[PDB]
C-alpha cells in the first residue's frame, strides 16, 4: 500500500530527496522517517483538509506503544492536489532539516538523537514517483 | 530483513542505481526487480560460492506459484566480499540493461513485457547503502 524505503540506512550526512504527486481530492498525506509504522522520528503531515486544519503542515514524532508527542506546525504550504511535489530531508543528531517544493524550509527536533533510520515511507493521499537516498 | 524499495514505480525510461557492500564471508546475494518476493521479473544472483558456482552471476525470472524459469549466466564478476559495489538498471519492454561496478554490462529479457515494477529488493549476504530511482 504505502510507498517505502526499508533497511537502506538513512544516516547522518546523507540526503533523502523524494518526489511525488498529491491525489486530486487529497485530505492529507505524510512523509515519515523512523523505525516502523509505530515508531517515527520525523512525521510531516500535509493537511489539505483535516478537522480545522486547512493547508497546514503538522510535524511530530511517534513513539512505539506510547503515541504522538508534541506537535509542531507550519503555515508554509507550497502544495497542490493533483500536482507534483519534491521534498529533501537531511538531519544531524539535533535537527531534521526539511526543504519543501518551493525551496522554503522547516526544521524539527531529532528528539531521540538518532544517527540513522531504517524506514522511510509515505502514507495517505499521494504517491511517490522518484527517490534519491545517498 | 531485506532492503527494499516498494510502491515507487520503476517505470520505462527511469534508472535504478543501487550501491552497497558485500558481506565478508558472503555465499551469495541478489538484486531483484519485480512485483513481490515470489514474482521477480529480473533476478540477478551474485554467487561467491554456491554449489559448483564460484564467482558467477546467475540471472532469471520467478513466476508466482510456478517457479524459476530459464537461467542465464555471466562470468563477469567485478565483486569482492567486504567491498562496495554499485549496479545500475534500466529497461524497455524487451530488455533489462544491467551495468556492473566496473562498467561491464549484462542484458536479460523482460519476459513479461512489463512497463513498470513496484518492488526492488536485495536479499542474501550483503547490504544496501544508497539508492537513486529516478
UniProtKB/Swiss-Prot annotation, chains A, B:
PROSITE patterns with a match to the protein in the record: GALECTIN
Entry GO terms, CC: extracellular space
Keywords noted in UniProt: Acetylation, Lectin
Annotated a beta-D-galactoside binding sites: 68-74
SS bond list: none
CDD domains: GLECT
Keyword Zinc: no
Residue ranges constituting the Galectin domain according to the UniProt record: 2-134
GO MF terms held by the record: carbohydrate binding; galactoside binding; laminin binding
Purpose: This protein binds beta-galactoside. Its physiological function is not yet known.
Subunit structure: Homodimer.
Protein's recorded name: Congerin-2
Organism of origin: Conger myriaster
Species lineage: Eukaryota, Metazoa, Chordata, Craniata, Vertebrata
Amino acid at each position: 500500500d504505502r510507498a517505502e524505503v526499508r533497511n537502506i540506512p538513512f544516516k547522518l550526512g546523507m540526503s533523502l530527496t523524494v518526489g511525488g504527486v498529491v491525489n486530486s481530492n487529497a485530505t492529507r498525506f505524510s512523509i515519515n522517517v523512523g523505525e516502523s509504522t509505530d515508531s517515527i522520528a520525523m512525521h510531516m503531515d500535509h493537511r489539505f483538509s483535516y478537522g480545522a486544519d486547512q493547508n497546514v503542515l503538522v510535524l511530530n514524532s511517534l513513539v512505539h506503544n506510547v503515541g504522538w508527542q508534541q506537535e509542531e506546525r507550519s503555515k508554509k504550504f507550497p502544495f497542490t492536489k493533483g500536482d507534483h511535489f519534491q521534498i529533501t530531508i537531511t538531519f544531524d543528531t539535533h535537527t531534521f532539516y526539511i526543504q519543501l517544493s518551493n525551496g522554503e524550509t522547516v526544521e524539527f527536533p531529532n528528539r531521540n538523537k538518532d544517527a540513522a533510520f531504517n524506514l522511510i515511507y509515505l502514507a495517505g493521499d499521494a504517491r511517490l514517483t522518484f527517490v534519491r537516498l545517498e
